[PDB]
Design a protein around this ligand. Structure first.
Ligand SMILES: CCOC(=O)[C@@H]1CCc2[nH]ncc2C1
Length: 121
């Protein structure tokens, strides 16, 4: 159907816009602390602590599969990156501090992404 094509065009453009948000968010992590999944080889008990791991590479796979239906889903996953880190790591660690910084800097990016998503429909 034509509707299904228009639908896919909007999903495809949502993906274009989310790709740009993801690039901007990941730019705020020059240390690449959040770039890849936490290694279950190097942290064998991680899943005892964190039930839903997340990282930027995993977000990007879902993004390119067009697996984000709206900004809220995308934001949930970003929030998992931050919140998992701030649980597993203690407050004084470079990891926890990097998550605080990423949350603070990313807040700005996501504020304007929400306006753009609403505005463009
Ligand atoms: C570069 C490796 O960094 C880490 O080892 C983790 C940072 C992200 C994270 N999320 N939950 C635990 C951890 C430790």
């Amino acid at each position: 159907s034509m509707e299904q094509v228009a639908m896919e065009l909007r999903l495809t453009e949502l993906t274009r816009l989310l790709r740009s948000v993801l690039d901007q968010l990941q730019d705020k992590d020059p240390a690449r602390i959040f770039a890849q999944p936490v290694s279950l080889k190097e942290v064998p008990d991680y899943l005892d602590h964190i039930k839903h791991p997340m990282d930027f590479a995993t977000m990007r796979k879902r993004l390119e599969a067009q697996g984000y239906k709206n900004l809220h889903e995308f934001e949930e996953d970003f929030d998992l990156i931050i919140d998992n880190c701030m649980k597993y790591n203690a407050r004084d660690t470079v990891f926890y501090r990097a998550a605080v910084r990423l949350r603070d800097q990313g807040g700005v990016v996501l504020r304007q992404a929400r306006r753009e998503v609403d505005s463009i429909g």
